[PDB]
Amino acid sequence: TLEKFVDALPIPDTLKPVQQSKEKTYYEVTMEECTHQLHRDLPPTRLWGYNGLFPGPTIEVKRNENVYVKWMNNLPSTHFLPIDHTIHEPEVKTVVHLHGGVTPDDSDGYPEAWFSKDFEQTGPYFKREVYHYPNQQRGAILWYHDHAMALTRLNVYAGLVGAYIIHDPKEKRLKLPSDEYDVPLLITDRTINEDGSLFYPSAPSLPNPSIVPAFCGETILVNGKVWPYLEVEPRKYRFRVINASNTRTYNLSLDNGGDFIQIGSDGGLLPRSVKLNSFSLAPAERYDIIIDFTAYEGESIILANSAGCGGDVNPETDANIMQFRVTKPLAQKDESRKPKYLASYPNIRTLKLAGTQDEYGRPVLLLNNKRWHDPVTETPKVGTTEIWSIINPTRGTHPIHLHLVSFRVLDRRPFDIARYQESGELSYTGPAVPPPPSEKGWKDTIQAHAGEVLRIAATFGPYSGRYVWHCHILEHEDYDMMRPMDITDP
């Protein structure tokens, strides 16, 4: 296996605008086939990257900045990863979803709004080349990634992911670590062949290739490098932790026993910070955290992982994320702060997660037993608030993502799965459990654990139109755990 901690952590450059005035900002981003070395001891890997970079450039914007992005496809006309034609016209389709963006529906990256190279061919919902991000929303860690119909697991795995940070200037009074002490950590597990090429499985009378129900990579990367190290000064740092992996959930900790200070979730700052010894981070979740290296001068500290992916973690491989080396000399005094008080925050629908089987014996994962192409059923009225009760009788956790909105977690409550299985009866085996401090703020991707009913409260706005909701395990999303969502307007 590849030698851990021999490559420095890349920090993606911040994208510079093509045009910026006091009232509009214009970006252009091209998807390019490119080659990048993922580890000291590997030949360069063929990847698909935004602006030919992996991860894509970090986009930084201000709350309410009027932002436009022209996302362009400069990619080959055939894919280099295994395509399964049975889960359903150009072979390569792309569309960019700004995950967590409060976005009008024609700029949200609808799966059927894809386009091929140079917009030559476009899907049925294609409408515009330049996407509009009004950014009228809390400061927060967003990220952007491909969302093309039936291809999302492959296009993201190929490298099409990037960070997107909304800065709210009113938060600058909290004096949280900033500038070079504010670092995104995009975590992606991959399997890499001896020759440096990406491996993605082509099989689980099955079709060949065949989609797989889950992908667990052999190696962990952060910001596009295998098991990297980051030299840090002995002071406070802010890290924007993004799980950009297809399937893998991480459970992070520090091997010197230190704590994290969580300050933010998907939808922005928590109401109050939380000292944590460890945390779970499923696909597309983000943790905004502070690590205080002040008391750890000279130490090497491993960011460790304890969560299995198709088996227990391997102490020599996926038990490891990255290594901090507290050996950078202090440039200036640490003027940053770790406040404990961060922010002040002032119909019912029932949805069933379940899996069936297709004609080939493969599992198909479904929301409410509906296919993607079935007529829409989740149709809340713009401006209305709903409580969604998400019932999970399956064996595993599903990280559920609702587009457009962020939501509040009400509670989780266990139920007997065998009983529910047959009579369809919701017989609770314990009291509801309110969200921990980590989930007392705003979320947009939420772990619905096995054998539990999860309740969330969302207000559906400010925009109306056609959106989606789905599991963010991309191997589930593509087959077929995704549904349209119409926010209706009278």
Is 36 labeled as ligand-binding? no
Handedness of CA 272, 273, 277, 278 (dihedral sign): positive
Q: Which stretch binds Cu ion (CB under 5 A): 79-87, 201-209, 276-284, 451-459?
A: 276-284
Give the shortest CB-101-to-Cu ion separation in angstroms: 8
Q: φ, ψ for residue 94 (rounded to 5)? A: -140, 150
Is 132 known as a binding-site position? no
Rg (CA), the chain: 22
Considering the complex, state which of residue 244 and residue 302 has its C-beta at the smaller distance from Cu ion: 244
Give the DSSP letter of residue 22: S
What is the SS3 assignment for 119? helix
**Of residues 142-201, which lie at the interface with Cu ion (CB under 5 A)?**
none
Give DSSP secondary structure letters for 346-371. --EEEEEEEEEE-TTS-EEEEETTB-
39 is in an annotated binding site: no
Shortest Å, Cβ 293 to Cu ion = 31
Please check if 34 is assigned to a binding site. no
Work out whether 69 is an interface residue with Cu ion (CB under 5 A): no
Q: Which of 263, 448, 473, 485 binds Cu ion (CB under 5 A)?
A: 473
Instruction: State in angstroms the smallest separation of the CB of 391 from Cu ion.
Output: 14
Min dist CB 160 to Cu ion, Å, is: 11
Rounded to a whole number, what is the distance in angstroms from the first to the last CA of the chain?
59
CB of 444 to Cu ion, least distance (A): 7
Q: What angle do CA 288, 300, 311 make, to 5 degrees?
A: 70
Distance of alpha carbon 291 from the chain centroid:
21
Q: DSSP string of 298-361?
A: T-EEEEEE---SSSPPPTTTTTEEEEEE--SPPSS-------SB------EEEEEEEEEE-TTS
Q: Compute φ and ψ for 140, nearest 5 degrees.
A: 180, 165
321 binds Cu ion (CB under 5 A): no
The verdict on 398 binding Cu ion (CB under 5 A) reads yes
Task: Choose the binding region for Cu ion from 57-65, 282-290, 337-345, 383-391 (rule: CB under 5 A).
Answer: 282-290
Binding mask 85-114 for Cu ion (x = CB under 5 A): --------------x---------------
Q: Which is nearer to Cu ion, 233 or 266 (CB)?
A: 266
476 counts as binding Cu ion under rule CB under 5 A? yes
The binding site for Cu ion (CB under 5 A) comprises: 99, 284, 398, 403, 471, 473, 476
